[PDB]
Design a protein around this ligand. Sequence first.
Ligand SMILES: [Mg+2]
Ligand SMILES: [Mg+2]
Ligand SMILES: [Mg+2]
Ligand SMILES: [Mg+2]
Ligand SMILES: [Mg+2]
Ligand SMILES: [Mg+2]
Ligand SMILES: [Mg+2]
Ligand SMILES: [Mg+2]
Ligand SMILES: [Mg+2]
Ligand SMILES: [Mg+2]
Ligand SMILES: [Mg+2]
Ligand SMILES: [Mg+2]
Ligand SMILES: [Mg+2]
Ligand SMILES: [Mg+2]
Ligand SMILES: [Mg+2]
Ligand SMILES: [Mg+2]
Ligand SMILES: [Mg+2]
Ligand SMILES: [Mg+2]
Ligand SMILES: [Mg+2]
Ligand SMILES: [Mg+2]
Ligand SMILES: [Mg+2]
Ligand SMILES: [Mg+2]
Ligand SMILES: [Mg+2]
Ligand SMILES: [Mg+2]
Ligand SMILES: [Mg+2]
Ligand SMILES: [Mg+2]
Ligand SMILES: [Mg+2]
Ligand SMILES: [Mg+2]
Ligand SMILES: [Mg+2]
Ligand SMILES: [Mg+2]
Ligand SMILES: [Mg+2]
Ligand SMILES: [Mg+2]
Ligand SMILES: [Mg+2]
Ligand SMILES: [Mg+2]
Ligand SMILES: [Mg+2]
Ligand SMILES: [Mg+2]
Ligand SMILES: [Mg+2]
Ligand SMILES: [Mg+2]
Ligand SMILES: [Mg+2]
Ligand SMILES: [Mg+2]
Ligand SMILES: [Mg+2]
Ligand SMILES: [Mg+2]
Ligand SMILES: [Mg+2]
Ligand SMILES: [Mg+2]
Ligand SMILES: [Mg+2]
Ligand SMILES: [Mg+2]
Ligand SMILES: [Mg+2]
Ligand SMILES: [Mg+2]
Ligand SMILES: [Mg+2]
Ligand SMILES: [Mg+2]
Ligand SMILES: [Zn+2]
Lengths: 157, 49, 102, 211
Amino acid sequence: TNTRGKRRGTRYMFARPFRKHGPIPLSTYMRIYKKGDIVDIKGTGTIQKGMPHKCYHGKTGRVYNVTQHAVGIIVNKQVKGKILAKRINVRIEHIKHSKSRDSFLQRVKENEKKKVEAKKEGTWIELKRQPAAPRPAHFVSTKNNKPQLLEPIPYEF
Amino acid sequence: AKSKNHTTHNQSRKWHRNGIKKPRSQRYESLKGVDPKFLRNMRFAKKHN
Amino acid sequence: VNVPKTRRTYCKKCKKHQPHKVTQYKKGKDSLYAQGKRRYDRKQSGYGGQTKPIFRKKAKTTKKIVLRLECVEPNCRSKRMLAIKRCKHFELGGDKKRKGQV
Amino acid sequence: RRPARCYRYCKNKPYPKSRFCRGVPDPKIRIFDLGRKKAKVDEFPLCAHMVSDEYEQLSSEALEAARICANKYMVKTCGKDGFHIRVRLHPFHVIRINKMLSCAGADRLQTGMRGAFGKPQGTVARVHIGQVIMSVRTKAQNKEHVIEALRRAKFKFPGRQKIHVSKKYGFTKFNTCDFDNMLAEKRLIPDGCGVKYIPSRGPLSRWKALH
RNA sequence: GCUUACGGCCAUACCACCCUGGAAAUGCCCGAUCUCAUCUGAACUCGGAAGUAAAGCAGGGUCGGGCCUGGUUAGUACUUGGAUGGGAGACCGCCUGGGAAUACCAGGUGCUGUAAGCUA
RNA sequence: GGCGGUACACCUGUCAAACGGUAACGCAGGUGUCCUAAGGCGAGCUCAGGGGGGACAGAAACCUCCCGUAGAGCAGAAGGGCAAAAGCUCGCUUGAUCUUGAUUUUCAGUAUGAGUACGGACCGCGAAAGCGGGGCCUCACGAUCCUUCCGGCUUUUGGGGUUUUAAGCGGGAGGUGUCAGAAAAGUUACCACAGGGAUAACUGGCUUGUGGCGGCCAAGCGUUCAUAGCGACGUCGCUUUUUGAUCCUUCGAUGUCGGCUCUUCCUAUCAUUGUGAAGCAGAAUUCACCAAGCGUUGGAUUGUUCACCCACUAACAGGGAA
RNA sequence: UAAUUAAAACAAAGCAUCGCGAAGGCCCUCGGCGGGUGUUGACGCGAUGUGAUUUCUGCCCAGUGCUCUGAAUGUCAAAGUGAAGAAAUUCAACGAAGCGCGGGUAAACGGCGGUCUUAAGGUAGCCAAAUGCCUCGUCAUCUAAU
RNA sequence: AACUAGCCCUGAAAAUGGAUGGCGCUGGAGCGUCGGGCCCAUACCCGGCCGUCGACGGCA
RNA sequence: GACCUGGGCAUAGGGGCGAAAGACUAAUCGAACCAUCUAGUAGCUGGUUCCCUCCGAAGUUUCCCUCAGGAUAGCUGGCGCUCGCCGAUCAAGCAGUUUUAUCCGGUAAAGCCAAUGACUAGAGGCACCUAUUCUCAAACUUUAAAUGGGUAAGAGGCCCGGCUCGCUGGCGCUGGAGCCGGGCGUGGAAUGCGACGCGCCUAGUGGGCCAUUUUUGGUAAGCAGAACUGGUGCUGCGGGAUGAACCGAACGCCGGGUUAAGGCGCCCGAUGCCGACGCUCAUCAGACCCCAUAAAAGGUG
Ligand SMILES: [Mg+2]
Ligand SMILES: [Mg+2]
Ligand SMILES: [Mg+2]
Ligand SMILES: [Mg+2]
Ligand SMILES: [Mg+2]
Ligand SMILES: [Mg+2]
Ligand SMILES: [Mg+2]
Ligand SMILES: [Mg+2]
Ligand SMILES: [Mg+2]
Ligand SMILES: [Mg+2]
Ligand SMILES: [Mg+2]
Ligand SMILES: [Mg+2]
Ligand SMILES: [Mg+2]
Ligand SMILES: [Mg+2]
Ligand SMILES: [Mg+2]
Ligand SMILES: [Mg+2]
Ligand SMILES: [Mg+2]
Ligand SMILES: [Mg+2]
Ligand SMILES: [Mg+2]
Ligand SMILES: [Mg+2]
Ligand SMILES: [Mg+2]
Ligand SMILES: [Mg+2]
Ligand SMILES: [Mg+2]
Ligand SMILES: [Mg+2]
Ligand SMILES: [Mg+2]
Ligand SMILES: [Mg+2]
Ligand SMILES: [Mg+2]
Ligand SMILES: [Mg+2]
Ligand SMILES: [Mg+2]
Ligand SMILES: [Mg+2]
Ligand SMILES: [Mg+2]
Ligand SMILES: [Mg+2]
Ligand SMILES: [Mg+2]
Ligand SMILES: [Mg+2]
Ligand SMILES: [Mg+2]
Ligand SMILES: [Mg+2]
Ligand SMILES: [Mg+2]
Ligand SMILES: [Mg+2]
Ligand SMILES: [Mg+2]
Ligand SMILES: [Mg+2]
Ligand SMILES: [Mg+2]
Ligand SMILES: [Mg+2]
Ligand SMILES: [Mg+2]
Ligand SMILES: [Mg+2]
Ligand SMILES: [Mg+2]
Ligand SMILES: [Mg+2]
Ligand SMILES: [Mg+2]
Ligand SMILES: [Mg+2]
Ligand SMILES: [Mg+2]
Ligand SMILES: [Mg+2]
Ligand SMILES: [Zn+2]
């Protein structure tokens, strides 16, 4: 069978991108991670301290504890057929702010920006998102765009 | 007398039989594992307000 | 593996980092009047043969070295057992390494 | 050895002779270019291939036998300096053979399928559908001899092969209808058996060296 | 526009060669008494101001290498799902969706934050 | 099954099908160590390699210059990571220390092991920010009982007191490599029982490597002449009269080698009937076709199938039917 | 070997070794110093091997085993002895047989090699054997052929 | 004249007598491309009945 | 003659006796017979008794001197209970599904004129060196999918004010966190569904097998070992003649209707159509998933 090593199979996930080796850019160190914010988990082989396990590389959770160099994350991990809330300690070099909820917070502020206009104008502009509706009826002009006759080309070996 | 070693064949059908329930993130999540210095001052900020 | 005979480590009784005298720990003589020895002789007495297991298939080639750290304080000569990893060769005096030599 | 019916299909992953697969015997074919290989581009304009129609693996012995069959026919019909045969399949996939399974024994660590991973037996060339097996460049008037030389070498290969007279100029990657026009514009320079593509996007000193 | 201090992203910033530039500033430069420093005041450290563009540095140049971006490759390769499709098989076609990469071609080549200073 | 091996506790790459997981006596390897520094910290330095040079000095001694993305090194397997580092050198050191809980991995989400982030002590290094509670990361390890040692003004040694002793509490070590941890040599053809077609020794079935048989291509042999007869290098098949591979049927039994005997069947035809071909003059022989109607022997040796020999003969062909 | 093996197996005479002088050897019994050998006494009893006669019976005492010493240096129980301690206890000296050391012994178990070499290197003999895989050895003979 | 593609043919040999399932089918009962009609599953639709379940159900 | 034989005696079970065969010791001997301990134990075979109704598995995880067994988790059932509907898709909440947004990866492919490694050929320049070239990787990769994994799509939100702190600190607001109060529904993707809600107890199972695809060992196997999903075991029914697994479709007892897959010369329901066009002659024709073999190579059919 396989080995139960903590880094078995992490040859490529913990490696660094091509021509992106060396020291970690310091902007990643000066990012503030408060409690309850959504962060991604992407382990780096450069910082061998506070590494997340390979099962959390690519997962996303929220921060519950903040320390000097690391952050406590609550991550979901499916073991066999149950999903468990894992509290893992990961240094800030292996995490980053998740832009998943940023699209939601952008829409929340934009929803509150457009409904206060209704209280000042008297409209009911719908705020709900809608799937891609069927294409409406349109006229396709052929003034300077004549339909070109296409034909299957003969076979060439 | 050899047998079958390992299988995960029927497991997915057993997992979704009772459903794969996500962990219920209850309101006011617990404070176990937080920084003891942070919890010490937080318990001082609660006994004085 | 050689460790120096002197260690300035933390002394639990002095509550402060004090110099210590490092000494290799030895088991010591088994007491003929320990409770486990008293009942082992009571059980082995009489007829019945060997009543306890006799471990045979040993596999370890060496054992963990224990260091008897005795505090050099005249009023606080408190000892402390400090175990290190397994090593086949362990010396306490030792001669320090020299890089730029033959 | 074992007949080629047993190692015909690309059933296993490519198993090359490397640091891990040690003990591979030397492939049967060691020479891949024959004829007047030291010929210029304008000397052998025609090119004909032996294109493979099946996704199989050709043994190194078949590549060696078909090379000799094609080489001997080109010498007697076009002379020893009137062709340049290029076997374009190098046997890199190593095929394995299990032990000589016998009745029983008190040694050899096994008698049946116990520890069945076999030792390297030979080398084959995994060919794909549409992949060239052998290429022959000759003069324009030797087209009938090249088609026949490659047709005889198909019988030394399993599966189905096609003999296609390429539109490229010789062993290059440029069509005949565009080859002579690119030589006039100094975009191609003869480099050994083929040409070297010279773009208009380098130092201008290299452009002056051509004109 | 430029010169520095600290930077952010970390080659569109690198590399080679060529040319131009000193207003302030920078650099080279001038010394070893002190602090310090080595085999050696080269470096490091310290003291200084005779010279001002050789280098650094900056800005240009190259049908430049590299890098970056886009096009082409290509709806190609591959691939989700489907058939009582084909073929002896190897494999292949179609249906339903998703969709690459090199060669090749073209363009571009640092952007910018804080603070201080200067208009050759 | 035994022998071998350890796939029994672990680690790397792959297998593994771009989360994770994923098997085989899959593949390529590694482990039961090593290190008072090869741990910690600070400072300085830049490596591998190549080139130009320079008394002895040369392909390799040392000095020096230039180039050098690391192609070196980092104790070890491999992978990852690393350039004012994590490498080299140097001088100061014992964060390889003392403690509580949380937590990751293996996981049942148990223990142990190995890790991470903290908190509280006491320290090291640095001007300082800081860094460090071993080794750049992934491996290098062990329950109960017992023994032993250390630690505690703190327990019991009981009808009280004192003092030995003993017990206990907390933490190490002594080891279980079958590594969640019995204390353990054979033989049985004199054998027994419970069972097993979960599992061998027959046939049968699948497969056909191997054995047997037949084709394709045509280098070459055949004085000359590829194909009368042969067929190298290659390649496609067939057959189940070889042997294996497998373990599907049978272990509350399918009687086990050979011969004898006897019947029928197959043709991949030895002979005989009718033919074609020749490197067929005749004779003899060879190749091929329709074709299994008919025949295919008597003996020496060996239990022998299989051999070998003696003769005879139109020929003394090969097989199947548990 | 009743009821699958009548034999080359067992026994056998002969040969050889071993133990033992009786408070003994060998062996029996839960036990009596009870009992068998023994109503016996080494030309005997007891324990083994070999297997008539004839002819011989080689070499090896390293290993294992048996046996013999005690100018026996070690290892070494209980009890006894000394010392320390309130005592339990601890320590120390003393220290039988046996082991170890030394000698003998192979008609004791067994062994008896490719300049190397050990403990001795298979001697007299015999043989493709009831013993030789290779092997249906080679030659001769025996038969048309073995 | 070369090449190519369908069907057919050669390549193509096993043992009890035997297997497109059999009979047989050759303007077909074969092959390929298709049309219309038709045949019936414990499937679907409508209805009857049995029971189970549900009812945000009905009655003292 | 080491002869045969009666009777009387002696030796008794781990004992006897044995010219030795493990022979004999009352048809019993590699340890007699009888009774008892004893209903000895067995993870091992065998069997395990009425009906109907409802729900309905597992052959996988970890540990075990385990691998014919257990423990354990999962799957199963039963018992409920908390609610929701009642009391207005009120709205939440949920999902083996999409949508939107945001990340994660190094497999297919591709690449090697890019690194590591393998490999062919010339050419240029003063064996190398430079520019090209052929062919490759599972333990190589610049590049890089499809499918897939995670997260977010609101009142547990958003915004605002005050207060607390021993933590943090130039700056009681500098951070941070906590507490309290106030303001604002156009519940701010689609679809579906009462919450597969919260517990407790719990049997069986822990030999699986098969198919598409992916995939390892092997010449291959109705072989061995994996991955996803379905099936099967546990399942009958229509069709494939036959059949475990293929195809269709899953089942209370029925009538009518219509289909699926498959069929409609006859067996045998249905073409007993004035079916369309073509191909094809076989002195071994051909005749439809799985599937019951056929190839290379040939034909002036
Ligand atoms: Mg492995
Ligand atoms: Mg581990
Ligand atoms: Mg570390
Ligand atoms: Mg198994
Ligand atoms: Mg099993
Ligand atoms: Mg006693
Ligand atoms: Mg200048
Ligand atoms: Mg350029
Ligand atoms: Mg385990
Ligand atoms: Mg996957
Ligand atoms: Mg470690
Ligand atoms: Mg600390
Ligand atoms: Mg005592
Ligand atoms: Mg064990
Ligand atoms: Mg079986
Ligand atoms: Mg063969
Ligand atoms: Mg000739
Ligand atoms: Mg041949
Ligand atoms: Mg099986
Ligand atoms: Mg019978
Ligand atoms: Mg039977
Ligand atoms: Mg019978
Ligand atoms: Mg015939
Ligand atoms: Mg012939
Ligand atoms: Mg008898
Ligand atoms: Mg007799
Ligand atoms: Mg005898
Ligand atoms: Mg005699
Ligand atoms: Mg004797
Ligand atoms: Mg002796
Ligand atoms: Mg012997
Ligand atoms: Mg002799
Ligand atoms: Mg045919
Ligand atoms: Mg109804
Ligand atoms: Mg009598
Ligand atoms: Mg008895
Ligand atoms: Mg016997
Ligand atoms: Mg009973
Ligand atoms: Mg087993
Ligand atoms: Mg059973
Ligand atoms: Mg259970
Ligand atoms: Mg269980
Ligand atoms: Mg299998
Ligand atoms: Mg079911
Ligand atoms: Mg069914
Ligand atoms: Mg059928
Ligand atoms: Mg009906
Ligand atoms: Mg029918
Ligand atoms: Mg054909
Ligand atoms: Mg022919
Ligand atoms: Zn002290």
